[PDB]
Design a protein around this ligand. Structure first.
Ligand SMILES: O=c1ccn([C@@H]2O[C@H](COP(=O)(O)OP(=O)(O)O)[C@@H](O)[C@H]2O)c(=O)[nH]1
Ligand SMILES: *[C@@H]1O[C@H](CO)[C@@H](O)[C@H](O)[C@H]1NC(C)=O
Ligand SMILES: *[C@@H]1O[C@H](CO)[C@@H](O)[C@H](O)[C@H]1NC(C)=O
Ligand SMILES: *[C@@H]1O[C@H](CO)[C@@H](O)[C@H](O)[C@H]1NC(C)=O
Ligand SMILES: [Ca+2]
Lengths: 355, 40
């Protein structure tokens, strides 16, 4: 009865091109795709317009020194971005760029001509250039009390998740699917409602975020207590959804050794194109219409389910290390700088970013 | 207007206020900064 899914998995694995690189070259196609609209060159006038439109924070690099406009709406996100740029700036040529640190992308594809804005998340309907989000170092959501200063330090969180996964080998994991998050997209609602109807099948509950104003923000129930990502690893099946844009939850779930149920296929981060459905995770239709069949399938094909979870965990373990984040930053900005068709001049009043 | 408070910009149990194309974090006593990140 599972032939359709079993064949899909065999097909996807036969199609799969494994990455054997020890560096971030496995993501190079994302850079090439994101820079394709700028192959005709980025002019000084184009850059001046992007800056005037305040689509992001204006950075400049000259002589391996980083400069920035005064204003940043989210200082902690600029600090996270700056952490990585400063790591690699000794090898970067002169350039300038606008780095959007808001959640949502800024350059819809229907805009002509394309203008270059760096954003952490997009869909294929945007021309923003993806970069590794600030949160790999600092500045992610401050979920009280578990991440009081903001979700960050991917290097440390990786280690904590690997230790937690070791405490919860697959066979000891709980078979009720699990989700804890806030109502940042209504696409999450059908899972919460399915959970309320069938709590043995799914344990999915809305926590509150800092914009909570009423019970409407938790679908009419008291908010659930927040749960550390390391405490997700006891569950076999972990759901991931878009929020405002893509969610930082996603990468963490793989390191639990659990099987990720990834809902939808529109909202991306730079590493997502290398994570493949049925190879690394279970794809779920955006409207959740096939979620009950998928949960029955994985329960009836637990050996396959485990194989998928282990591949996803290994991919994040081996190809989304801190060094991959820094490498991608360096390769992205180096490649981007080639398309500036003019010589950058430091702006009056931009302070240097140290250290 | 984007409600920036949805992404929990305020640290250390501060309160987030969504304003006209900006947000403000109202710190617990003892904290300051845009994100209430500086512990006085
Ligand atoms: O109980 C919770 C709720 C949230 N988070 C994390 O906090 C961040 C924000 O989650 P939320 O659902 O509020 O927003 P999202 O960014 O997913 O739209 C994500 O990395 C979640 O994994 C968490 O670890 N535990
Ligand atoms: C990165 O890895 C690829 C092979 O995976 C190799 O061709 C390339 O030379 C490497 N680059 C550096 C700078 O190590
Ligand atoms: C599995 O988790 C669910 C949901 O959290 C819980 O209700 C159930 O009791 C757990 N089952 C076992 C056997 O621990
Ligand atoms: C830009 O700078 C390069 C390298 O310093 C120089 O050789 C070139 O003449 C300049 N081109 C301009 C200003 O158009
Ligand atoms: Ca606002």
């Amino acid at each position: 009865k599972w032939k359709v899914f079993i064949d899909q998995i065999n097909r996807s694995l036969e199609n799969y091109e494994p990455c054997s690189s020890q560096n971030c070259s496995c993501y190079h196609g994302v850079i090439e795709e994101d820079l394709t609209p700028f192959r005709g060159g980025i002019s000084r006038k184009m850059m001046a317009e992007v800056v005037r439109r305040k689509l992001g924070t204006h950075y400049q690099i000259t002589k391996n020194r980083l400069y920035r406009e005064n204003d940043c709406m989210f200082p902690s996100r600029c600090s996270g971005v700056e952490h990585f740029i400063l790591e690699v700036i000794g090898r970067l040529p002169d350039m300038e760029m606008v780095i959007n640190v808001r959640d949502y992308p800024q350059v819809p594809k229907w805009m002509e001509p394309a203008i270059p804005v760096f954003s952490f998340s997009k869909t294929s309907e945007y021309h923003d250039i993806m970069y590794p989000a600030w949160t790999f170092w600092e500045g992610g959501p401050a979920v009280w009390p578990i991440y009081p200063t903001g979700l960050g330090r991917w290097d440390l969180f990786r280690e904590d998740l690997v230790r937690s996964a070791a405490q919860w080998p697959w066979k000891k994991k709980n078979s009720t699917a699990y989700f804890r998050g806030s109502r940042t997209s209504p696409e999450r609602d059908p899972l919460i409602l399915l959970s309320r109807k069938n709590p043995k099948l799914v344990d999915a509950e809305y926590t509150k975020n800092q914009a909570w104003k009423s019970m409407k923000d938790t679908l009419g129930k008291p908010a659930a207590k927040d749960v550390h990502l390391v405490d997700h690893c006891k569950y076999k099946y972990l759901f991931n959804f878009r929020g405002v844009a893509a969610s930082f939850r996603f990468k963490h779930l793989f390191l639990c050794g659990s099987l990720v149920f990834h809902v939808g296929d529109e909202w991306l981060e730079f590493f997502y194109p290398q994570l493949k459905p049925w190879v690394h995770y279970i794809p779920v239709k955006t409207d959740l219409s096939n979620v009950q069949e998928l949960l029955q399938f994985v329960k009836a094909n637990d050996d396959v389910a485990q194989e998928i979870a282990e591949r996803g965990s290994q991919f994040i373990r081996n190809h989304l290390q801190m060094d991959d984040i820094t490498c991608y930053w360096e390769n992205l900005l180096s490649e981007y700088s080639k398309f500036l068709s003019y010589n950058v001049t430091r702006r009056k009043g931009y302070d240097q970013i140290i250290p | 207007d984007v409600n920036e408070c949805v992404t929990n910009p305020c640290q250390n149990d501060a309160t987030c206020l969504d304003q006209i194309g900006e947000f403000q974090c109202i710190c617990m006593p003892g904290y300051e900064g845009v994100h209430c990140e500086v512990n006085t």
